[model samples]
Target chain A: EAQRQFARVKLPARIRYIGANREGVDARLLDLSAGGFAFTASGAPIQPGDLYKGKMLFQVDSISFSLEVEFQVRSVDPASRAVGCEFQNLKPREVAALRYLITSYLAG
Target chain B: EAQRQFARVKLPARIRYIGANREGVDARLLDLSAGGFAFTASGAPIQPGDLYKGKMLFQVDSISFSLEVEFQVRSVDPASRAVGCEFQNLKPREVAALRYLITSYLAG
Candidate 1:
């Protein structure tokens, strides 16, 4: 479950993932793909297999771009506070945006 | 000033552009590029040669993405309410994101 099927790329840090609790948590986005994404956070309530229904936001150049995101935690390293997740019923538009971000990441 | 140097793509409808008045006005995005963007607004206090310091927001799905934007109105059609503008003093990061959106729009 921890393994991602699609290739991933590291995104800019300080991306915010607003969780189901409606609280926005600033996380370091390790890598991302259409299928899944990984991030690291500290002092937050997250666990393996936990279902997260949230908004994934990318604040770039004063522009906050976000998506309706739901993911299942596939793996968690408690000591490092690293979390790996897989997309749960991601919509086509979400996937398209993800792909666009991935391409932009590579192009830049 | 009315002629755009780069290619552009029509963005989705209902994009909000927060102007100097700090009011979020819904607009139908006509076309966009790194150079500039055009849109139509009915009853907005906007006109040619007017300087606008504001934010350009794209609300897609559940996400509202925004950018710090400033432009000089190049032309305006009173009857049609179509406004044409040219970007002024845009940053590199802002330009990159604009280019990414343009590519994404075409790709989609």
Candidate 2:
């Protein structure tokens, strides 16, 4: 089931898949919130508790930065074939980036 | 004042600020839509009728692509210090990227 909760958060700076492995499967970032983000891609879906490296780039009013964080696949919806993940150990810069992105939009 | 209308469109695949020239300013992407996108940057904001080069990147499940287009600054709000621009000549890949981003989120 799709979560109808729309958490009030900042927009993403930049979203892109790192690279696909042998399976020709790449990750896709669906939406981002301060708490976490959701992603999907080809190949077998990642299992819960699986840790993957991900990056989020943010550009706010001319300032741009990249966030490197660890994401734990939390839930996989078989019907939709999408994965929900929680971001962990976000650096201070990433938090700032997210804040700036959100503030800029809200302020605008 | 911010426009209250939210036209449905795909999410941008990727967004980043280009280099800052002697002006010591950069352009920032606020939000994107099929109609156009809103932007703001440092330095004397691009005057109305100014054209700029911008790129938006997108990633799905694992598929990643980029959109290169020319943007025309339409309006500049002195009160908010933001610029509203319309994107033009969007490549097919860019449109595909935006579509995939939105569909994935709505689908998820």
List clash counts for every candidate, in order: 0, 9
CAPRI-style docking class of model 2 based on DockQ = incorrect
TM-score, per-candidate, Cα-based: 0.74, 0.39
List ranges where model 2 is wrong by over 4 Å.
A1-26, A58-64, A106-108, B1-108
Whole-model Cα lDDT of every candidate shown, in order:
0.74, 0.56
> lDDT per residue, candidate 2, A1-108, as tens digits?
867442545354444443335343344456666556776645654678877775666543322345566677788888886677777776554554344444445654
Chain A TM per candidate, in order of listing:
0.75, 0.62
Error of 1 at A38 (Å): 2.2
Which candidate leads in lDDT?
Answer: 1
Candidates' DockQ values?
A: 0.58, 0.03
